[PDB]
GROMACS .gro file of C-alpha atoms in nm:
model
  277
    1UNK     CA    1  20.445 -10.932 -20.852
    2UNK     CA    2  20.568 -11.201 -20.604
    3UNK     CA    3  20.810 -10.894 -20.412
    4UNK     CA    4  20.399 -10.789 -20.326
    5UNK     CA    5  20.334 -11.132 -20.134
    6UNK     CA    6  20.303 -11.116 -19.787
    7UNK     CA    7  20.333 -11.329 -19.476
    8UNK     CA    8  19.973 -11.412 -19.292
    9UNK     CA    9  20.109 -11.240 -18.959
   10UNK     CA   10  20.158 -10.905 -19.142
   11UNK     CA   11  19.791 -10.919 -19.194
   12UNK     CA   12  19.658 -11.062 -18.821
   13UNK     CA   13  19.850 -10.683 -18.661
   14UNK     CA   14  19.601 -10.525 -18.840
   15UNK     CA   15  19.274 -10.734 -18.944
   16UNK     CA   16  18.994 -10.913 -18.660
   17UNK     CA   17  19.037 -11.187 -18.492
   18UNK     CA   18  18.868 -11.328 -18.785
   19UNK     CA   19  19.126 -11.262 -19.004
   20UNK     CA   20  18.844 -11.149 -19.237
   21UNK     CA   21  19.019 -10.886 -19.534
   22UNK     CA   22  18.656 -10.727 -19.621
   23UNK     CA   23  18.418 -10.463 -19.570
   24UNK     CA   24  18.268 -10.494 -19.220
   25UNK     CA   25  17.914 -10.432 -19.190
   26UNK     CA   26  17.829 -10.199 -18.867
   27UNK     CA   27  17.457 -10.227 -18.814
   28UNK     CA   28  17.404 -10.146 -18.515
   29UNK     CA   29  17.672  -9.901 -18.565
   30UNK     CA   30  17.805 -10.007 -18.213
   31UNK     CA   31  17.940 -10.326 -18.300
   32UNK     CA   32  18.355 -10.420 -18.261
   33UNK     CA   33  18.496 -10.525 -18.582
   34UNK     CA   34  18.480 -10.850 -18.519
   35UNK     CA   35  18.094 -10.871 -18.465
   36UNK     CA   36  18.064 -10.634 -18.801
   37UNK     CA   37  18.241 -10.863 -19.020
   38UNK     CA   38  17.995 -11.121 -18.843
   39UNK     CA   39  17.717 -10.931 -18.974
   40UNK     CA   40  17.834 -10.879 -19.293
   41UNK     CA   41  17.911 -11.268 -19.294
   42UNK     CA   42  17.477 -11.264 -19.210
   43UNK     CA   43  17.394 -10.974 -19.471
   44UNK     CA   44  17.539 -11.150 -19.719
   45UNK     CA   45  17.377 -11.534 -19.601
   46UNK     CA   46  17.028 -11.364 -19.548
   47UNK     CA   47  17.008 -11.285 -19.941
   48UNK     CA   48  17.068 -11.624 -20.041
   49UNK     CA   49  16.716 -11.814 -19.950
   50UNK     CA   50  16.888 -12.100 -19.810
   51UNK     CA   51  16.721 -12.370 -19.707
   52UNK     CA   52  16.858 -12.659 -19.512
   53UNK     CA   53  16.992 -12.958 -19.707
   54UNK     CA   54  17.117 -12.722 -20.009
   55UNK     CA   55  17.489 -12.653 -20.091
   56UNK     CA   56  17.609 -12.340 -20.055
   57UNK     CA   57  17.958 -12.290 -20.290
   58UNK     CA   58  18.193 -11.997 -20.124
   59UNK     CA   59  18.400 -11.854 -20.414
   60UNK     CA   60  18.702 -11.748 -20.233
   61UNK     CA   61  18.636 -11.861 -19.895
   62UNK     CA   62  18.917 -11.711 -19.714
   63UNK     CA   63  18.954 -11.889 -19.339
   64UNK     CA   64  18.655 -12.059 -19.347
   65UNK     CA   65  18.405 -11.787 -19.192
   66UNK     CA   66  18.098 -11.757 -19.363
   67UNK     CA   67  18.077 -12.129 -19.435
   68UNK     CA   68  18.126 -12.198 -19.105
   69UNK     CA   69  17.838 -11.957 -19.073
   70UNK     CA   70  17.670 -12.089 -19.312
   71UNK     CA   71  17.659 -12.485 -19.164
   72UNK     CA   72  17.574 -12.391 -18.812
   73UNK     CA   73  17.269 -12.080 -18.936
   74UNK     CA   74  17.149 -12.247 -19.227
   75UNK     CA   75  17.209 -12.638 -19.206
   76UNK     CA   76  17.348 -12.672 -19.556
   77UNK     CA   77  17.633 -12.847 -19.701
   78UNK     CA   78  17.924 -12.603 -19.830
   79UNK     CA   79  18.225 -12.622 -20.107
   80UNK     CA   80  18.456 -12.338 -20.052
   81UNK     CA   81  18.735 -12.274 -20.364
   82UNK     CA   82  19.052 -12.066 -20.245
   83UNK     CA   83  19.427 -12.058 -20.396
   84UNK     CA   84  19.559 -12.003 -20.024
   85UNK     CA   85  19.709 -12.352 -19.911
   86UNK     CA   86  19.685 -12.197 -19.531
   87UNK     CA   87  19.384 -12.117 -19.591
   88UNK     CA   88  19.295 -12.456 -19.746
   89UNK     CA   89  19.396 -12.570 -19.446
   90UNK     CA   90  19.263 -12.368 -19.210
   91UNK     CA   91  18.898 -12.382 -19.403
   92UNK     CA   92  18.919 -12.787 -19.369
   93UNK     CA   93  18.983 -12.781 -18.953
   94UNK     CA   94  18.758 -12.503 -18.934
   95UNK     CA   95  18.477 -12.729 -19.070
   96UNK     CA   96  18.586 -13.077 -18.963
   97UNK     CA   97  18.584 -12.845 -18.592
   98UNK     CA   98  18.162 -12.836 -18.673
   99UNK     CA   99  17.933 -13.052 -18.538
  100UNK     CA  100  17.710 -13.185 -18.813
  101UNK     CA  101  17.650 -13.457 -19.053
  102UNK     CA  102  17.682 -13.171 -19.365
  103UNK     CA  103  17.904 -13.262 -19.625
  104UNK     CA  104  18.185 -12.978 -19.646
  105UNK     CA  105  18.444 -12.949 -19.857
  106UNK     CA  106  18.717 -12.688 -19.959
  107UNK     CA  107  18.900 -12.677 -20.275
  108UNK     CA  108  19.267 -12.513 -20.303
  109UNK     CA  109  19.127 -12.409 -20.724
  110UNK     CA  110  18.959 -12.097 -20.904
  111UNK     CA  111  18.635 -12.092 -21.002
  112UNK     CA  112  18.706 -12.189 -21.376
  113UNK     CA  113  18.772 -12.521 -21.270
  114UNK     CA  114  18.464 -12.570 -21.056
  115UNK     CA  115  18.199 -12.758 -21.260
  116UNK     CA  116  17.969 -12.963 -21.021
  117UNK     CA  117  17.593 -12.837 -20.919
  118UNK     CA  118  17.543 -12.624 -20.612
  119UNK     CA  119  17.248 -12.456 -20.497
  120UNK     CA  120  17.340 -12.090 -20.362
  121UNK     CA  121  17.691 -11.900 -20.414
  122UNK     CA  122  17.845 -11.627 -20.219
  123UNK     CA  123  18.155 -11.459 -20.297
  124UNK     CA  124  18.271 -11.176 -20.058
  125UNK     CA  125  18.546 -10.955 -20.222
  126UNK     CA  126  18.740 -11.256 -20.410
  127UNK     CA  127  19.056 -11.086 -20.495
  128UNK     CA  128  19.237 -11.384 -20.616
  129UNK     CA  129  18.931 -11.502 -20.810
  130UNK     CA  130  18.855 -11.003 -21.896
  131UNK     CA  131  18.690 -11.369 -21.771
  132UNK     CA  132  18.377 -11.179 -21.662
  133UNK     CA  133  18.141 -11.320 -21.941
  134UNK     CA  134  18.252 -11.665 -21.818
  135UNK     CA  135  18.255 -11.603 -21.481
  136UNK     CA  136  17.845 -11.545 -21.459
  137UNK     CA  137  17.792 -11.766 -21.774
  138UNK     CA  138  17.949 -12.037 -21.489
  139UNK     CA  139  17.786 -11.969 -21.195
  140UNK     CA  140  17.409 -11.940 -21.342
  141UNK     CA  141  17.506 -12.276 -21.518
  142UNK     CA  142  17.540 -12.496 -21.197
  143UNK     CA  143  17.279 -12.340 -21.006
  144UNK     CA  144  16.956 -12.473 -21.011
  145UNK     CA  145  16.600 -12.269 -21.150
  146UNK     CA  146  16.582 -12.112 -20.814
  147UNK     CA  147  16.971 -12.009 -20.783
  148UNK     CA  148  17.091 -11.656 -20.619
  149UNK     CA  149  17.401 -11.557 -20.604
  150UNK     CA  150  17.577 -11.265 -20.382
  151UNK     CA  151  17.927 -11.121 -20.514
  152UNK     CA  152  18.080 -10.814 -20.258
  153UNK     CA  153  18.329 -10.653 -20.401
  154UNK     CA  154  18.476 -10.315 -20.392
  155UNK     CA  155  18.430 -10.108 -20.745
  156UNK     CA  156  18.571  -9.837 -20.910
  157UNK     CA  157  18.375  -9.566 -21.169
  158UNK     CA  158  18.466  -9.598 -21.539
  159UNK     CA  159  18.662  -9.291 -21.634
  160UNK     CA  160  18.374  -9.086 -21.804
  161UNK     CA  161  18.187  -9.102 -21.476
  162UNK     CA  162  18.531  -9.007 -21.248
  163UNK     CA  163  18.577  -8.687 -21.462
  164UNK     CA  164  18.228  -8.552 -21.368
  165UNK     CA  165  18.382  -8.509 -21.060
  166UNK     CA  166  18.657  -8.278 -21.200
  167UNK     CA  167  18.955  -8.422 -21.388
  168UNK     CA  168  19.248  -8.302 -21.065
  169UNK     CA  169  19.052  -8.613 -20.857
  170UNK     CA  170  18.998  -8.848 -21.149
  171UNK     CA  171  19.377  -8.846 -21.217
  172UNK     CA  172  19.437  -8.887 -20.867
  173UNK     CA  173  19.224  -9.146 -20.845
  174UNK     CA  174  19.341  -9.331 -21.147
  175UNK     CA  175  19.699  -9.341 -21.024
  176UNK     CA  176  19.580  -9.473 -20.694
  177UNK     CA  177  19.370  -9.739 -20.820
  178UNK     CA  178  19.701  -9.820 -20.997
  179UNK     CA  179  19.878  -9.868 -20.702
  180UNK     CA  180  19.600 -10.076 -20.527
  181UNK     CA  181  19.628 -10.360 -20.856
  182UNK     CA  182  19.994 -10.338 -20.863
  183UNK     CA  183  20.109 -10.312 -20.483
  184UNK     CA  184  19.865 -10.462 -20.311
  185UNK     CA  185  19.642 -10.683 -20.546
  186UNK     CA  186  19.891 -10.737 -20.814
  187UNK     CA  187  19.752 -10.846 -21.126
  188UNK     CA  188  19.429 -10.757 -20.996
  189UNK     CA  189  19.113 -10.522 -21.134
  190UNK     CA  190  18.848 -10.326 -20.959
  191UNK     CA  191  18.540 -10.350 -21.212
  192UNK     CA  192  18.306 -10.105 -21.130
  193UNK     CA  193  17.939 -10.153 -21.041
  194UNK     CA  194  17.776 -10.085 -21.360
  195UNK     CA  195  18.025 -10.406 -21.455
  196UNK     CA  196  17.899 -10.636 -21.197
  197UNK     CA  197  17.519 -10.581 -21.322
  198UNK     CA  198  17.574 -10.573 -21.709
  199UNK     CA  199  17.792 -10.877 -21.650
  200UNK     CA  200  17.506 -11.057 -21.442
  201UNK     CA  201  17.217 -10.928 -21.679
  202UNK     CA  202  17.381 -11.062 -22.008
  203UNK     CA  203  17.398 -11.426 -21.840
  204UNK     CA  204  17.054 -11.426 -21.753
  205UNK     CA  205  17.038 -11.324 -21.422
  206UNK     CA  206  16.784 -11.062 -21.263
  207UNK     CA  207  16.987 -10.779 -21.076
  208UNK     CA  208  16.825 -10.584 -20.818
  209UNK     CA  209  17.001 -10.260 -20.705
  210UNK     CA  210  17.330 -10.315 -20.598
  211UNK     CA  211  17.402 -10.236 -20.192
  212UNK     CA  212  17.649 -10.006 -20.131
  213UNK     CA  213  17.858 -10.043 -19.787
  214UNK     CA  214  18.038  -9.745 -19.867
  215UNK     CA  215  18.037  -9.591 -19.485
  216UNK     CA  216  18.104  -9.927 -19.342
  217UNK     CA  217  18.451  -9.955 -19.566
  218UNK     CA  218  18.539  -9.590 -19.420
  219UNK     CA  219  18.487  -9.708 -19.068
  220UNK     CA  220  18.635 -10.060 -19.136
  221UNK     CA  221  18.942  -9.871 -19.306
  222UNK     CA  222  18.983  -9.628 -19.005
  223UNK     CA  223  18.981  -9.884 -18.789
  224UNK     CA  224  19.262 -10.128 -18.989
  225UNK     CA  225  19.410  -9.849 -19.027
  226UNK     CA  226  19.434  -9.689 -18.659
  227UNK     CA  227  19.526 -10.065 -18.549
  228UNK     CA  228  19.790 -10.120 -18.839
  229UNK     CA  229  19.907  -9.820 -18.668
  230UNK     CA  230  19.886  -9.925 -18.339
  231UNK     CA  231  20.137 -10.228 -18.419
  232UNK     CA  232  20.373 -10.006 -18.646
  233UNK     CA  233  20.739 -10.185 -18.465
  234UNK     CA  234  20.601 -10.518 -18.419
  235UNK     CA  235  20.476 -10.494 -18.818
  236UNK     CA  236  20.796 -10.363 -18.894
  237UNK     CA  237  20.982 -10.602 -18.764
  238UNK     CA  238  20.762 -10.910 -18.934
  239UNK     CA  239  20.825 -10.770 -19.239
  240UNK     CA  240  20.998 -10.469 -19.375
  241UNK     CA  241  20.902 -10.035 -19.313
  242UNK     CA  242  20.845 -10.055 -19.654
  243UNK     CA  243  20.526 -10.303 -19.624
  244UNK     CA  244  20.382 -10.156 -19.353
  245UNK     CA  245  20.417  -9.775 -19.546
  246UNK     CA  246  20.239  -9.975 -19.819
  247UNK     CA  247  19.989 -10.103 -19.613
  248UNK     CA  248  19.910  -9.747 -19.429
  249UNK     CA  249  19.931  -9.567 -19.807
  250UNK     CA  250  19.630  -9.843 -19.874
  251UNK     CA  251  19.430  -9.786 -19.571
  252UNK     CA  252  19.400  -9.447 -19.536
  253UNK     CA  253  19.455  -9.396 -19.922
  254UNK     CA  254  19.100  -9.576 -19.936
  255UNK     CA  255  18.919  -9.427 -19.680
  256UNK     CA  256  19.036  -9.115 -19.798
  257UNK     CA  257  18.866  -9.191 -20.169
  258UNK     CA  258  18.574  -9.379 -20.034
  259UNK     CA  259  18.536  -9.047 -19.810
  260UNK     CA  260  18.496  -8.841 -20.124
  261UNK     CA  261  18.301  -9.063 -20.307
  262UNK     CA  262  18.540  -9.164 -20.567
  263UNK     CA  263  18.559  -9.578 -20.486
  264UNK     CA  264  18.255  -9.765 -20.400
  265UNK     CA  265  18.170 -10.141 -20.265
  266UNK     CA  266  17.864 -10.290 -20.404
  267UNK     CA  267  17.718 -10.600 -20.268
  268UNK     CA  268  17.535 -10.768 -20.591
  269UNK     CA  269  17.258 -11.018 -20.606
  270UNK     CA  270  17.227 -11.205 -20.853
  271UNK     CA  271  16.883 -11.402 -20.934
  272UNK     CA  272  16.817 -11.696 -21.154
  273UNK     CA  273  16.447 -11.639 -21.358
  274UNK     CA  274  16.284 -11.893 -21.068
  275UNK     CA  275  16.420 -11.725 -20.766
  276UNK     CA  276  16.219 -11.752 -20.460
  277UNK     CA  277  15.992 -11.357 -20.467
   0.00000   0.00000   0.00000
């Protein structure tokens, strides 16, 4: 699994200047990259019904982007949990950089060792982060009677639902899916939507219908991918031909299935009984 890591300059020849590893959100479809994944940063924010003075908890919070976001939009204090020690790093300069009397912390941990109250959480396609039950058991737990949560994630169909669309793709599909939670998110799972809502229900949670961002992964993909690309020696040469043929079999291998319908990213909400209407 550890042959799979790679170096944070691998990613930065094909990623924003963000460095943000998500679904961008294009509305207006004009925007660069850079001010999509800044407006899915918002789309994801504007859900919450924050209010100044509560925490916000980021549940794999990456280099520091949305709660930096968060601070400056919504004048809240923010706890980010990530397993990235550069990133730990990064997030704590990122919001020491602010300029505000917040209180905002970052935690190098998973969420199953987070225990203390918070008022709003986001989590925007937390790789790193079977432990579903105790994952939404947890977070409607330390959120307060008016707690909402937001989890983005990209999803997969159970395989009853892929072989409606003819068994030739769902195999196809299958063995890709493989690849993408063995080559490039080892160890990891893509639940599928129905998951994420029967998850959230059965902890008590109300769960309105689930956003797809479906043709903003395509264009996010195409453009990774075109940039990836772009950079082929220079990526090469940080790492191995072999990564980067990885990393193009991944980009255009998803917007190639997202294309025909046969992945998905939902954006969930998730309200506690005494949500805000």
């Amino acid at each position: 699994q550890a042959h799979y890591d790679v170096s944070d300059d691998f990613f930065a020849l094909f990623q924003d200047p963000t460095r943000t590893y998500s679904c961008a959100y294009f509305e207006p479809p004009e925007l660069t990259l850079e001010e999509a994944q800044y407006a899915k940063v918002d789309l994801n924010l504007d859900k919450l019904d924050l209010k100044p003075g509560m925490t916000l908890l980021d549940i794999g919070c990456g280099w520091g982007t949305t709660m930096r976001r968060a601070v400056e939009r919504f004048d809240v204090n923010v706890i980010g949990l990530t397993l990235s020690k550069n990133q730990h790093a990064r997030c704590e300069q990122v919001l020491a950089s602010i300029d505000t009397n917040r209180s905002r912390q970052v935690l190098l941990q998973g969420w199953e060792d987070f225990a203390e109250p918070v008022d709003r959480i986001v989590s925007i396609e937390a790789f790193e982060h079977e432990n579903y039950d105790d994952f939404f058991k947890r977070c409607f737990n330390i959120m307060p009677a008016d707690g909402r949560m937001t989890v983005q994630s990209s999803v997969s169909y159970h395989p009853y639902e892929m072989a409606a669309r003819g068994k030739k793709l769902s195999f196809e599909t299958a063995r890709f899916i493989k690849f993408i939670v063995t080559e490039i998110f080892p160890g990891g799972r893509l639940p599928s939507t129905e998951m994420m809502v029967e998850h959230g229900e059965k902890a008590g949670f109300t769960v309105p219908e689930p956003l797809s961002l479906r043709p903003h992964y395509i264009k996010t993909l195409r453009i990774w991918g075109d940039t990836l690309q772009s950079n082929k020696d220079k990526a090469i040469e940080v790492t191995s031909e072999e990564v980067y043929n990885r990393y193009m079999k991944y980009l255009r291998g998803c917007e190639h299935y997202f294309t025909d319908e046969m992945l998905d990213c939902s954006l969930v909400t998730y309200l506690k009984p005494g949500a805000a209407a």
